[PDB]
Design a protein around this ligand. Structure first.
Ligand SMILES: Nc1ccn([C@@H]2O[C@H](COP(=O)(O)OP(=O)(O)OP(=O)(O)O)[C@@H](O)[C@H]2O)c(=O)n1
Ligand SMILES: C[C@H](N)[C@@H](CCCCCC(=O)O)NC(=O)O
Ligand SMILES: [Mg+2]
Lengths: 227, 226
């Protein structure tokens, strides 16, 4: 195959989609082929479409979804409110494996934080990660509380021997206050911090977002993701 | 000894202190003796002082603390900014074990979440809870994301064989809303929700607060704690 990364986060609203787009953008400019996959997508009735937003910021054309629920809730609840069911575990794995391909980087963005239920019964993105032998990239905030949430998430990853590919601070304020600056230093002691995306990046146009994306990550780390 | 309960939360700002006070008030109205220990308090320059709130709301007088850092940061950050270490692990565990006595409910309120650093070198409320054989009361919100954060916390609890005494929703909005109504049901699918405290209770005076607290917890559970 190729390389699969699940792109998880310490919670919902932390910047997973923007990180998916930025890493996708940076890997494309390195000549790497990129697919982004969004198996469970809630809140469509509010115009939430994470695949579309990755396409809008990054120009990614290989977008694969699967389940779509109208309400902006946890997938279990959004499905119950629509009269629908959750996908099965193997349905999600199949969607990912069909994208996987030598030389391709396949990013898999979850619904919210790592332990959210994606498929019956209580199947999470952690289980999906184990099935496809993927590593997890954890998107974190710079805000008060991020150290605990990060440690909890990493611990839950190691419970099932899912490797951590590093952290990404989804939104990095300019200028950074005392708490942000301190947290960035402390997060670096817990794991490799791969990038710190500037706040408001979704308002950068194609070229600016691509500029920001290449500068955000270490070139050698991005290139070493896929052989 | 008696019952030691550690009071943790899924994050910062979930209302641990109001839950400590509410649980305290309930237990006293069942005639139980309560102590509250807040080993480390931060944000004191702007007047953060969670033990005073417990005294006012619940009338607890055995109120125990070891360190106060002016900066409103996580304790180890607050310590570094001030130029001083955190307390030692021994101080925390022995202050708590010294509060503990037969007939008493001893609540231990952490800072932030379960894995935040509370003492040198890098010891957490979870370590403390292990050292004193306490179960953990998990304070949660009702907002989008509470499920992930709760499951994460309960998983960390279990990883070190710390028992979970339950969840309390620190703040129940009015009116609930679709997410909060569904979350209250969902949280109950992963652990015993012990109470949901009405939004704004923190601001009550002690008389009304005592009434709220009396009705917020199940009486048999409160009694069954000690
Ligand atoms: N460097 C960043 C990070 C985030 N955002 C904005 O902050 C919000 C949250 O980011 P998002 O990527 O959507 O967070 P997710 O973790 O993907 O939340 P969800 O669970 O809904 O997928 C979005 O409006 C996004 O445009 C931004 O402009 N610049
Ligand atoms: C509606 C949000 N945007 C998100 C769902 C977040 C679920 C949070 C569940 C929880 O942990 O309580 N949907 C999504 O990322 O597709
Ligand atoms: Mg997203």
């Amino acid at each position: 195959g190729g390389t699969i990364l699940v792109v998880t986060g310490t919670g919902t609203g932390v910047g997973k989609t923007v990180v998916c787009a930025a890493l996708a953008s940076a890997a494309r400019q390195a000549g790497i082929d990129v697919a982004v996959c969004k198996p469970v997508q809630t809140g469509t009735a509010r115009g939430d479409d994470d695949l579309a937003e990755v396409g809008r910021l990054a120009g990614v054309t290989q977008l694969a979804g699967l389940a779509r629920y109208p309400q902006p809730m946890a997938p279990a609840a959004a499905a119950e409110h629509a009269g629908m069911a959750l996908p099965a575990r193997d349905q999600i794995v199949r969607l990912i494996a069909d994208l996987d391909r030598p030389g391709r980087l396949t990013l898999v963005e979850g619904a919210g934080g790592l332990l959210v239920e994606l498929a019956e019964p209580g199947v999470t993105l952690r289980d999906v990660a184990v099935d496809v032998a993927a590593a997890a990239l954890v998107v974190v905030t710079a805000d008060l509380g991020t150290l605990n949430h990060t440690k909890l998430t990493l611990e839950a990853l190691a419970a099932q021997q899912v490797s951590c590919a590093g952290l990404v601070i989804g939104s990095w304020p300019d200028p950074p206050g005392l708490v942000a600056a301190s947290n960035r230093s402390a997060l670096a002691r817990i794991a490799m911090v791969r990038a710190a995306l500037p706040a408001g990046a979704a308002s950068l146009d194609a070229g600016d977002f691509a500029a920001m994306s290449a500068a955000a990550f270490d070139r050698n780390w991005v290139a070493g993701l896929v052989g």
